[PDB]
Amino acid sequence: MFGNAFGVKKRRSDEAEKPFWISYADLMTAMMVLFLVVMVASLSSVTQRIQRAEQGEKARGQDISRLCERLELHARNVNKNIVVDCHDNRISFGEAGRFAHNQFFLNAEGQKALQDVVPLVLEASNSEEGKKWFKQIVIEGFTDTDGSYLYNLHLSLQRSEWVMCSLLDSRSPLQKNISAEQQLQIRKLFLAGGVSFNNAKESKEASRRVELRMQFFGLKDKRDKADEVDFPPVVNKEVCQLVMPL
Amino acid sequence: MFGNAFGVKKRRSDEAEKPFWISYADLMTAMMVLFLVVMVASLSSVTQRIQRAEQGEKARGQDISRLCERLELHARNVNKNIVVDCHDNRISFGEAGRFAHNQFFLNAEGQKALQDVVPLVLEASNSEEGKKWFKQIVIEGFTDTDGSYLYNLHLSLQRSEWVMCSLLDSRSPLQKNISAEQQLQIRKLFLAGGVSFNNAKESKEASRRVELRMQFFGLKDKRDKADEVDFPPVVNKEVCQLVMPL
Amino acid sequence: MSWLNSILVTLTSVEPYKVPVTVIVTVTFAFVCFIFFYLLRSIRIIYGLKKYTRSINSIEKSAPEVQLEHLKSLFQRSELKHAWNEFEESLHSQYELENGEEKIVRIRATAPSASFFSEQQLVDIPLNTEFFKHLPGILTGMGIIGTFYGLMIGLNHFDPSTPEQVSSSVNNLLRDVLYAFLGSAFAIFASILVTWLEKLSIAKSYKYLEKFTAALDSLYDSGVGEEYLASLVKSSNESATQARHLKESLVTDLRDMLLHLAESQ
Amino acid sequence: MSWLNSILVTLTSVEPYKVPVTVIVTVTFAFVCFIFFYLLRSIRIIYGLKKYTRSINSIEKSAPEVQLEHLKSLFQRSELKHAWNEFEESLHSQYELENGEEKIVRIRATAPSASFFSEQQLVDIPLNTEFFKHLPGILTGMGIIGTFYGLMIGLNHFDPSTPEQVSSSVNNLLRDVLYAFLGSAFAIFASILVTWLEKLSIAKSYKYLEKFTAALDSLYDSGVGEEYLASLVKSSNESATQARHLKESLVTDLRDMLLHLAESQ
Amino acid sequence: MSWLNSILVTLTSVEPYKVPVTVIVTVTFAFVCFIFFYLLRSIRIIYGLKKYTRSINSIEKSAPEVQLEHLKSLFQRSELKHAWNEFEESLHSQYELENGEEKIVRIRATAPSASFFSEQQLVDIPLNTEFFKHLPGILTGMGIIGTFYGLMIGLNHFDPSTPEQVSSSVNNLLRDVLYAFLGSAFAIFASILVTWLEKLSIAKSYKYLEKFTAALDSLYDSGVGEEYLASLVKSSNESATQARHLKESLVTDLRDMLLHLAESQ
Amino acid sequence: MSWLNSILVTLTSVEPYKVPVTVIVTVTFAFVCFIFFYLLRSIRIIYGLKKYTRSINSIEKSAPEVQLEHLKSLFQRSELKHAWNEFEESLHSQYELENGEEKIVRIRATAPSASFFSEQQLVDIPLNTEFFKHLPGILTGMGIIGTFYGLMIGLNHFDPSTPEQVSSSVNNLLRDVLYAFLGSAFAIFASILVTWLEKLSIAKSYKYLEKFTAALDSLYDSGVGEEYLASLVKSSNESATQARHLKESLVTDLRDMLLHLAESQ
Amino acid sequence: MSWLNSILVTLTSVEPYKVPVTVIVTVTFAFVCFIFFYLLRSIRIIYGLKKYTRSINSIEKSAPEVQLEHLKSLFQRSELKHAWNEFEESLHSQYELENGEEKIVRIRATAPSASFFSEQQLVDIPLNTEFFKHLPGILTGMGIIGTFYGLMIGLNHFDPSTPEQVSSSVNNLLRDVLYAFLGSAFAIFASILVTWLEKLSIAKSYKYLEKFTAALDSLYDSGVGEEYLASLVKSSNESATQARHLKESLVTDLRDMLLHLAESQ
Numbered sequence A, B: 001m002f003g004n005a006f007g008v009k010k011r012r013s014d015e016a017e018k019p020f021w022i023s024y025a026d027l028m029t030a031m032m033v034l035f036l037v038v039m040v041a042s043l044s045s046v047t048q049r050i051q052r053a054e055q056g057e058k059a060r061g062q063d064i065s066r067l068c069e070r071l072e073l074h075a076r077n078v079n080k081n082i083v084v085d086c087h088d089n090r091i092s093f094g095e096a097g098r099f100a101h102n103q104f105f106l107n108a109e110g111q112k113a114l115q116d117v118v119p120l121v122l123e124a125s126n127s128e129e130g131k132k133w134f135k136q137i138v139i140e141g142f143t144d145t146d147g148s149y150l151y152n153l154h155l156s157l158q159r160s161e162w163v164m165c166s167l168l169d170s171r172s173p174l175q176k177n178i179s180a181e182q183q184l185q186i187r188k189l190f191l192a193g194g195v196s197f198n199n200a201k202e203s204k205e206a207s208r209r210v211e212l213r214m215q216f217f218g219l220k221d222k223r224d225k226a227d228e229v230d231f232p233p234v235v236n237k238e239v240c241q242l243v244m245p246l
Numbered sequence C, D, E, F, G: 001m002s003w004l005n006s007i008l009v010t011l012t013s014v015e016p017y018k019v020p021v022t023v024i025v026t027v028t029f030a031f032v033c034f035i036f037f038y039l040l041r042s043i044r045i046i047y048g049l050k051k052y053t054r055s056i057n058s059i060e061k062s063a064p065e066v067q068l069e070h071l072k073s074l075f076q077r078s079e080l081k082h083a084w085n086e087f088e089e090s091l092h093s094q095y096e097l098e099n100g101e102e103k104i105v106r107i108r109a110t111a112p113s114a115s116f117f118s119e120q121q122l123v124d125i126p127l128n129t130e131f132f133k134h135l136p137g138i139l140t141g142m143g144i145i146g147t148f149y150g151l152m153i154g155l156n157h158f159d160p161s162t163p164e165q166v167s168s169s170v171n172n173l174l175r176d177v178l179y180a181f182l183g184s185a186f187a188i189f190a191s192i193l194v195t196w197l198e199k200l201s202i203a204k205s206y207k208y209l210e211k212f213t214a215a216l217d218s219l220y221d222s223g224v225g226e227e228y229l230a231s232l233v234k235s236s237n238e239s240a241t242q243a244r245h246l247k248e249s250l251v252t253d254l255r256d257m258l259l260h261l262a263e264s265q
């Protein structure tokens, strides 16, 4: 009847975001973050020795691959007959290294390739990478499983003896282009010996070959000094004892 | 003024709860739990993979040590001149393994020991440890650093060849004692290695010696038929290549 | 308790893909209900309000009886029929004397039309806004339940025994949570879409209801009570003045009358 | 602090299944209280409102005193009895002198029936909506407490300190987290179910209360005060007219009388 | 800068146990404040409202003067004293000349009692609801702050610089997380308890205040303005006829007097 | 089911960088929509209210008819035309007869101007405040969807089967977490920025709407009906006094006149 | 995409310690703005209201004109001055002739003073509550945003190339998580502090504004309109009775005068 027309009505006031839900979202995001970062830290710590070992292995592989690439580039620049297999640290002379039946000699190109690759491998090993990771060079022998075992063994042994003879025989062309220090290095870094049997190749003719295979120190070796020995200076020229005229 | 004091009131509809921070918080709770579970599970799994690798290495080392110990015990039971070093996986000859200038064959005691150790090697390889870890055997020759280098290499290589004959010579007692399967296993096992010149203490009697060492599979090494070279059945007798007047 | 483990193995035995499909189906059913019972009815209400507004604006120049009959004929929907009846009760017809008859010359408003064509009766009740404004929260809650259910399925089958079992259990848990989160993401997208559609629809419904009530309010002038009071005050003052004037006129007439009587006698 | 460590060992010593069991039981108790005190009560209120609306519609074409007696006998629940008494005070009975007595010929409304049969008094207070609208938040908070406390138990059990027993610790952690999420999921499901039920019930209750108040409002016509004011304005105008006419008539009668007296003289 | 490092070193230097202790102490203090300033106050207000309602119901059959004096003496509390004074101003006393003096025969209501004994003045302001409805959020925030600070302490103590220190570091960090979660869980539990008690108290306060205002309203009848207007309309309608009848009777009496005068002459 | 298998396999392969890109694009679209439909409109509305208030205050000391014409011209070509028409209807013009003409000497308010220029019509509906108060929640929901999906992708790709690839797994997982966090931070930043902007703008809009409605209210004084009632009461009392005085004066004049008549006779 | 990488490089090029510094500084700036624009202003409002309440209570026993002049001089703030002007024009002055000029003998209230000195007018708009009630959520959101941004910086700069680079990246990530914890703790602390202060201030403002408006309401009595109507009803009845009595007295005096004239004749 006499009601107040000017009665005011408070506006519908949007109600705010409850503080709990945003704070709780913050807390749960923080907890997720904490668990993630704790996992990262814990995994990094438990595998840190493994990570350091793997980094060392990768560095050794990279250094060895760089040395092999330098050696194969030098071979390509100098003599095409020298082919270097960087996959498994192998030096091959396929065409030059073919061996006929019951003979332990090689043609002229094989001798040229050997006496050309020896100084290159020497100067590669003389570098810091070589002085840090290069061990002595092992001469590879291959024999078949057919016929008399000892005949093949003797053939391979004579092949290895003839190889080192060609490296270190008097009147050889290598001796005319060498110094005493290089000869001593060849004596230190080369040993002759080793036979093997394999069936990864389709032809028995491939077994009649000579191959150079260098091998490197282990990660825990680090060039033990006691293993190294010394040799006296050369007093007389070496003479091969194999029967050249046959 | 003409309005009524008894009018409708409570003109205020309830605001709905804002849902999206709630959903954020709940889903983030789920993610926090996921990250906690992943953290604990991953830490456990990685720790167990490190410990499983460590225990594999330890068990392989224990198997190698047990094989070496039982082989050395068998060698002592057979004859007392065998020197076995489990620290470096090597078997040597103390006194019977010596050699003189221009000599390439062991004395009677050396031949007896060489023939006696072959069945011991066969038994060691036949055991479960031999199946699991045993690799092929290489033969290392040692000679003084004095004299002609080629002469010493040829002498050591001749010693290795004569040893291999005595292992596989038909006239030798081993061939008439072993069977076809044992002969094939010997062909698989015994290999010819290189020649070393570890000269020390100025003792030429002990420097010129030959001993056989044993290699083992690694944990990561894989056994495959490619490396398992199978010699054919023996169709004819084998005669050694160096004749006595040499 | 064994009962808790039994209900847990029963709950976690369902296939993980059935959690997202359950959430998606139930969210979709809720969305279809929202479309049918809120959005379509709101669009119909808005269109009808526009039509009613156009009809009201067509009789702005009509006679009060004509437009009163037009408005009565226009409103037939039950809620609007009742609203029109009450609003017409609130209208004050002013009658005047023409040709010895009492006829309506002007219709006055005593209340705004929004008092009767209110937002509640015409929008909020028909759209069930008291229920549908809370629907997005329900949808998001269903999504949260789905994600939690998938997480529980993953956790119950987790086998931390060996590293291989750890890896397989982690992959299975993540796959189950990913199914459940597909359901939850569908729920959250539906909640967003429902929020937008609902709020836009309610705003436009209020807008066109205000247009409708403005169209109605423009037909009738308010303020009749104050005008009546002013008229009564003026009438009281004029009545006092006229009482004085009529008394003086009566005295003068009596004087003249008795003067004539004296002359005659 | 020894007190805090004692508190922690007390809290973490409880069997982990007791946390989700407590959450489920308390949430179920809150749900049953909601069903009994809100949902069934709201259903009864809606049913009664429908029956009252039917009864009111049955006396649309009855006499005002018959209607008034019917409505007085109809409303007997305490809140509706009081609402009816107040509303009846708001009704204005218009009297006319018929056959020597004053009889009610019409009953006029002065206020909307909703001013007395309000949503507050008839729905919100009997349903205790000022509490129950906050119940889903309470349920979700109970689920959150369960989640926090189950995670605390899981973290307390996680102390393997030995590579052999890491798997058992992870299993116990997974079990405790599973319990926590079971409790939380049940609490959220109950919260959304409660939200659905109570919003739907409140929407229906408002809709049928509006139908009830519209049925009551259609019985009586408003606008009696402006009619009275218009009558007073008309009476004042006709009062001035009647005053002048009576003065003129009295003057004419006096003229006739004194002419008669002169003729007698 | 270095200032951030310094304040981070200072903050994380406290023992992890002091954070849950601080959270528990402060949350308990806020809970005690809620109990004192809100819960006990609401219980007192409800009990007083029930007592007042009983007092009002006992004078339902008393005389208006006796009712008025009883109500005046009954309301002794600043808020209710002022509310009673304003409401009594809203009441309209009707005086009838009895025994030569103006006596109150009836007191009429012109406003509902809830307009003066309102929820804001009698519940909301005395209970400080504008603050206490936000207390649960404050308690949860305090708990979350404690949890964050405990996480800072735990994370700062986390430093596995060695592969063999990883498991111990993880275990200690999970323990510190447990401390922080303890604080948060206590805070959330207290917040839920406060929400429950507060909302129930509001519901009961509003219900009993409604009972109180309904008791006050039932004492006095409304609608006196329309009765006065109908009386004025009736007086005007009767005044027209009274003026006509008085004029006619005056004319008849004048005619009789002049006839008698003529006969006497 | 096969369809769900295809859906899961296609969602699993989603390249992680695409999720934050989608979140950022959608959030930027929402922000541009907010700027265009809310912020710029609110700025224009605040400017319009300011201009209206300056116009209203510029006729504070003008004649009432000049005020009316100025306000009608101010509002006639705008969306506030009908609100002004209704408010002007609520304006009661008091008339006095000056120089033989009926002229407006004063204009009286019977209602606050806010009952016609409401927040809803002038601010809330044009700005779509019903929806835009939910936009920060909408953005938070987008953020949680994108971030949860990204974290699930990262966890699913985190599967170190060997210790040696732990470093790479950590690196890739950190990249994926970075993508998810980028999405979340952008969404939440937009949410907070939108909240800030729209709350500030709505507060300013309400402030200036209050200034506008207060400027309208300042023009015309209220309380005319009580003045009219006081005038009527005074007139009734003074009319009783006037009737008594007129009767006494008529008696005295009649006595003197009859004495003169007797003297003349 | 290259766009995403460029955005990441730009965002993460900032130093890690700047995110917590920015969070703390922005939160502290918002807190200082809250203090300056809300808390100090609210304290001024409350203190002024208490002073005005004391002043109003000091004029309880003063003359109405003295009270009016005192109150007019009291209110000088713009919103207060406008509220007083509107309330005063809602006050009805009752005039009496004592003895040759109109004197205000009583002032009657026709509206509650809260209708003009309202919470919206006097607290909500000056305090900008429409904005500041959303500030704590903004603060907490900035805490969350800081967490995400700092973690992005940590993740983007993670270097896995070298074991020591891994260790430095891990340390930086841990430091960033600590920074995020500190920023969130500070933000939530400020948000709850702002909530506490704001809600306490708003509760006290409403309390003391209620005391102020109650003090204003105590000065003036309502219910004048019903008194005027009752006076009019009594005057109408007494006017009918006095008309009959005056007719009787006039006819008796006319008879006496006629008898005297006849006797003189």
Ligand SMILES: CCCCCCCCCCCCCCCCCC(=O)OC[C@H](COP(=O)([O-])OCC(O)COP(=O)([O-])OC[C@@H](COC(=O)CCCCCCCCCCCCCCCCC)OC(=O)CCCCCCCCCCCCCCCCC)OC(=O)CCCCCCCCCCCCCCCCC
Binding pocket: C042, C043, C046, C186, C189, C190, C192, C193, C196, C197, C200, C201, C202, C204, C207, F025, F026, F027, F029, F030, F033, F034, F037, F128, F131, F138
């Ligand atoms: C780059 C892309 C990246 C982003 C993509 C995703 C974006 C997500 C963002 C989410 C939120 C952002 C939106 C903010 C803007 C809204 C502002 C507002 O209030 O409206 C302004 C305006 C209306 O207000 P106004 O300014 O007063 O209008 C004046 C009128 O012109 C006349 O005045 P009037 O008052 O007389 O009006 C009469 C009234 C009366 O009409 C009514 O009855 C109204 C009430 C009911 C409305 C019925 C319409 C239903 C439409 C169904 C869905 C269609 C499309 C769905 C989109 C999402 C699907 C993916 O009519 C209307 O107002 C209706 C107009 C609204 C319809 C919009 C047209 C359809 C889409 C526009 C196409 C342009 C392309 C943009 C991008 C497309 C999306 C990818 O409406 C718009 O223009 C809005 C369109 C802008 C974009 C909308 C995107 C949809 C948002 C929903 C999120 C989807 C969730 C995920 C789905 C997954 C499910 C599983």
Ligand SMILES: CCCCCCCC/C=C\CCCCCCCC(=O)OC[C@H](COP(=O)(O)OCCN)OC(=O)CCCCCCC/C=C\CCCCCCCC
Binding pocket: C178, C179, C181, C182, C183, C185, F008, F010, F011, F013, F014, F015, F018, F019, F022, F023, F026, F142, F145, F146, F149
């Ligand atoms: C608008 C929503 C608001 C907030 C969004 C939240 C974030 C969720 C979203 C999204 C992922 C990004 C969308 C995909 C854009 C790519 C378009 C394009 O150019 O190519 C089309 C593509 C060709 O490239 P691919 O074959 O995919 O190459 C893969 C190589 N690794 O083929 C197509 O035509 C369409 C394929 C669609 C893929 C993405 C599907 C995502 C759909 C909806 C997202 C919903 C949330 C996700 C939750 C997942 C729970 C299991």
Ligand SMILES: CCCCCCCC/C=C\CCCCCCCC(=O)OC[C@H](COP(=O)(O)OCCN)OC(=O)CCCCCCC/C=C\CCCCCCCC
Binding pocket: F182, F183, F185, F186, F189, G010, G011, G013, G014, G015, G018, G019, G022, G023, G026, G141, G142, G143, G145, G146, G149
């Ligand atoms: C201040 C923002 C207002 C509101 C913010 C709300 C949320 C609060 C949170 C968090 C994170 C803030 C980021 C840090 C800001 C610091 C700015 C700065 O110092 O710029 C300097 C910087 C580096 O300088 P130097 O000293 O040379 O660095 C050498 C390093 N060796 O160079 C510059 O000039 C500017 C670079 C621009 C970076 C862009 C960051 C954005 C800034 C502010 C808004 C933050 C919103 C976060 C949302 C994230 C979206 C995914």
Ligand SMILES: [Ca+2]
Binding pocket: C109, C217, C218, C219, C220, C221, C222, F086, F089
């Ligand atoms: Ca109108």
Ligand SMILES: [Ca+2]
Binding pocket: C086, C089, D109, D217, D218, D219, D220, D221, D222
């Ligand atoms: Ca009606």
Ligand SMILES: [Ca+2]
Binding pocket: D086, D089, E109, E217, E218, E219, E220, E221, E222
């Ligand atoms: Ca009553």
Ligand SMILES: [Ca+2]
Binding pocket: F109, F217, F218, F219, F220, F221, F222, G086, G089
């Ligand atoms: Ca004014």
Ligand SMILES: [Ca+2]
Binding pocket: E086, E089, G109, G217, G218, G219, G220, G221, G222
């Ligand atoms: Ca008062």
